[PDB]
Paper text:
MG1 stabilizes the hub protein 14-3-3/peptidyl-prolyl cis–trans isomerase NIMA-interacting 1 (Pin1) PPI. This small molecule forms an imine bond between the formyl group of MG1 and Lys122 of 14-3-3.17 Notably, 14-3-3 is a dimeric protein with each monomer binding a single phospho-peptide and molecular glue, independent of the complementary monomer. Given this independent binding behaviour of the 14-3-3 monomers, the crystal structure of 14-3-3 is depicted as a monomer. Aldehyde-based molecular glue activity is initially regulated by cooperative non-covalent binding, followed by slow covalent ligation, further enhancing stabilization.
To investigate this hypothesis, we performed a td-FA assay were 14-3-3γ was titrated to a fluorescein-labelled Pin1 peptide in the presence or the absence of a stabilizer, and data was incrementally collected over 4 h. The resulting data was then processed using the workflow described in Fig. S2.† To compare non-covalent and covalent molecular glue stabilization, natural product fusicoccin-A (FC-A) was used as a non-covalent control stabilizer. Analysis of the crystal structure confirmed FC-A binds at the interface of the 14-3-3/Pin1 complex similarly to MG1, however, does not form a covalent bond with 14-3-3. Notably, 14-3-3σΔC, which is C-terminally truncated, was used as this mutant simplifies crystallization and is highly homologous to 14-3-3γ in structure and sequence. In the presence of FC-A rapid stabilization of the 14-3-3/Pin1 complex was also observed (apparent KD (KDapp) = 2.9 ± 0.2 μM), correlating to a ∼10-fold stabilization.
Author numbering:
A (entry chain B), D (entry chain B): 70 to 73
B (entry chain A), C (entry chain A): -4 to 71, 75 to 231
Write the structure that this text describes.
């Protein structure tokens, strides 16, 4: 999944 | 440290040069030097610090995952201790970088951070680096590391909700990462999904208040929330 | 060195793991350790050595170019010594890596290399690393460095022509890189073009002798020759 | 230009  | 003799302004300048050159190890060292001058960081400077270490640790995480997987496949012909040794080497270096970042946050970025923008930023970082420690933790202390990540994200969340609009990018990125923590580390996929949805929905409802550039900034991180929701549901 | 206590076979194994993980600095250190065991390298091992250092130095070259350009634009508002300092830092580290590789070739890879495949391979490397030294050289010794690159490429070329078929990939890659040396370093674009053309044409004429896999191997490097010819004419 |  994506994080920033 | 080794940057003790360099002017703070020179360290920041060189951090920016290192970013342009994609020299993230150097960038991180320059920013560590700048933090160790003892002055608070500006918004731009905080971002330089985060980007530098995110890229350094990002590379280490990607390599660790490649190695850990090779290792797992080895433990399903006997190749000897080399895969484990080299995974351990990368792991130890990753742990080192995380400990360095956490050390900077503890000495003394968090304690001097009074404004919401800075305090939330540093607590999110604290959550993130404990999350990276958690990803490789297997000893007894996996739990305490996980709780340390959770505690830092929670404090950041409590502040962000009281002091920032729902579209604030730090608030959005914090929620994004806390939702990842829930899904990947805390074995709480429902909480992850609930957090990502609520965050996305509350941001959408506040977009009307924004300028064209803020709207672009907010919608971008919103898209990352949407991407996770699509992957998870 | 620091790899003195590790088995040669373990160093090679870890070099391969480092490649899979895109950890080229580690890969290079493992291969340096393996070379320092004092045994000749196999074909596969030579390739591991080359790939490791090519990637390390490649990153340094790319960063140096970004910095050197920023520097050149600064010398067309006064920003102080920082850009020059940081370019010099990257330059010195690049020089260091090149000196390390050249040292390995001199102690004692080249002297123990009897077969054409190994001797041409190591002399090409010698040409390549002196070429990288030349790219950043500005002092009096730019000329001697350039001549050192030229001498090594020439010796490699003489051997390759006598002992290898025109489609041999090492021979092709040597010619490719010597043609780049002529164009970018020696201010000899006509020689570069002539070399690339002759090499391409002589390889084409020998493709009929190859298996399907060799043909694929040879045509690939031929395409790089073609790409340069297209850029240069 | 390209090298190998
Ligand atoms: C520091 C390096 C540079 C490249 C100069 O800037 C990084 C970025 O710095 C700012 O963006 C931050 C920011 C990021 C943005 C989402 C990037 O957006 C775009 C449009 O590229 C990602 C970065 O890693 C950074 C600094 C980090 C965080 C993160 C920090 O956790 C502690 C929380 C969310 C996010 C916040 C702080 C963003 O505001 C800016 O708003 C961005 O500018 C634009 C055009 O939106 C710029 O790309
Ligand atoms: C060492 C690392 C790995 C990735 C395992 O192998 C690198 C590569 O090693 C071999 O290829 C060499 C080789 C390269 C090939 C052109 C790559 O081809 C393909 C199909 O990817 C580039 C590499 O950097 C390498 C090792 C270097 C050289 C260069 C050395 O100068 C001193 C001269 C030309 C070229 C020669 C030695 C090539 O034979 C093999 O023939 C390649 O396999 C195939 C499928 O062609 C493999 O990708
Ligand atoms: Mg303060
Ligand atoms: Mg021999």
């Amino acid at each position: 999944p994506s994080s920033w | 440290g080794a940057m003790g003799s360099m002017e703070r302004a020179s360290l920041i300048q060189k951090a920016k040069l290192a970013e342009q050159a994609e020299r993230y190890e150097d960038m991180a060292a320059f920013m560590k030097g700048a933090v160790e001058k003892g002055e608070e960081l500006s918004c731009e400077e905080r971002n330089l610090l985060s980007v530098a270490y995110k890229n350094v640790v990002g590379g280490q995480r990607a390599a660790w995952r490649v190695l850990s997987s090779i290792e797992q496949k080895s433990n399903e012909e006997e190749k000897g201790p080399e895969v484990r040794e080299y995974r351990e080497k990368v792991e130890t270096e990753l742990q080192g970088v995380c400990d360095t970042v956490l050390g900077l946050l503890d000495s003394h970025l968090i304690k001097e951070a009074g404004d919401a923008e800075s305090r939330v930023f540093y607590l999110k970082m604290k959550g993130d680096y404990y999350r990276y420690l958690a990803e490789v933790a297997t000893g007894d202390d996996k739990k305490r590391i996980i709780d340390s990540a959770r505690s830092a994200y929670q404090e950041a969340m409590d502040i962000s909700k009281k002091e920032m609009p729902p579209t604030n990018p730090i608030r959005l990125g914090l929620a994004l990462n806390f939702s990842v923590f829930h899904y990947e580390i805390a074995n709480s996929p429902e909480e992850a999904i609930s957090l990502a949805k609520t965050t996305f929905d509350e941001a959408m409802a506040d977009l009307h208040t924004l300028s064209e550039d803020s709207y672009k900034d907010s919608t971008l991180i919103m898209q990352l929330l949407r991407d996770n929701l699509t992957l998870w549901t």
